[PDB]
């Protein structure tokens, strides 16, 4: 049920330790990375216009 | 001899490279002043929007409809109720071009025509 991610935890066999933690700021790297990937086609399509117009 | 041809000659070549540097200062002054003319015309354009702001203070203008043109250059125009304001429209627009039974653009107080409307 950690593998189905119903809650926060991770187990141990040598030590038997449970650790509970979370990551709240999920929406930063999403919008950042998607802004990079959407700007990829801007720069590459720009290079298609310029590679068109020069050579 | 060989100085004004050679030493002052290359000093003059260095002066020609200085003319290349003033071709760089020249064309920077060119494109920066074209940018300056762009900002001058754009800020001048919103300044002319402030010139329009008195016609904003006009509360807009009305919609004239001429139904009959009068031969004394004082056109009777059918207006919104309590209207029917007979008037000479503005001097830069002729009367005969304004065809009757058609809608026009009229100022709300000065009663001068702007254009014919469909």
């Amino acid at each position: 049920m950690i593998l189905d991610k119903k809650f926060h935890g991770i187990l141990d066999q040598g030590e038997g330790v449970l650790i509970i933690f979370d990551e709240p700021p999920v929406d930063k790297t999403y919008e950042a990375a998607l802004e990079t990937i959407q700007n990829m086609s801007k720069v590459v399509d720009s290079l298609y216009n310029k590679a068109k117009k020069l050579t | 001899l060989e100085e004004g041809k050679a030493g002052s000659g290359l000093r003059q070549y260095y002066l020609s490279k200085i003319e290349e540097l003033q071709l760089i200062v020249n064309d920077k002054s060119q494109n920066l002043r074209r940018l300056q003319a762009q900002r001058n015309e754009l800020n001048a354009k919103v300044r002319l929007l402030r010139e329009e702001l008195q016609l904003l203070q006009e509360q807009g203008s009305y919609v004239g409809e001429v139904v009959r043109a009068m031969d004394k250059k004082k056109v009777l125009v059918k207006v919104h109720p309590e209207g029917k304001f007979v008037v000479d429209v503005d001097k830069n627009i002729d009367i005969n071009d304004v065809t009757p039974n058609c809608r026009v653009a009229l100022r709300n107080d000065s009663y001068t025509l702007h254009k014919i409307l469909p």
């Binding site: 700021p25 929406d27 930063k28 919008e31 950042a32 802004e35 | -």
Partner: protein, 57 residues
């Protein structure tokens, strides 16, 4: 305008009105000790403006 005309209007402002009204108005846009609301928005960059940064994105 017939029988009824008008007259131009100009002003005067001396330097006590100028700097009293000027620092009065800059102070009307500045704070008391003036260092007060700085760290507030420096730390609203961490609390509030991050939401406006995501919405900006």
């Amino acid at each position: 305008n017939r029988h009824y005309y008008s007259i131009t209007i100009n002003y005067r402002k001396n330097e006590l009105e100028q700097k009293m009204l000027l620092n009065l108005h800059k102070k009307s846009w500045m704070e008391g000790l003036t260092l007060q609301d700085y760290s507030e928005h420096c730390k609203h960059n961490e609390s509030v403006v991050k939401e406006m940064l995501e919405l900006a994105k």
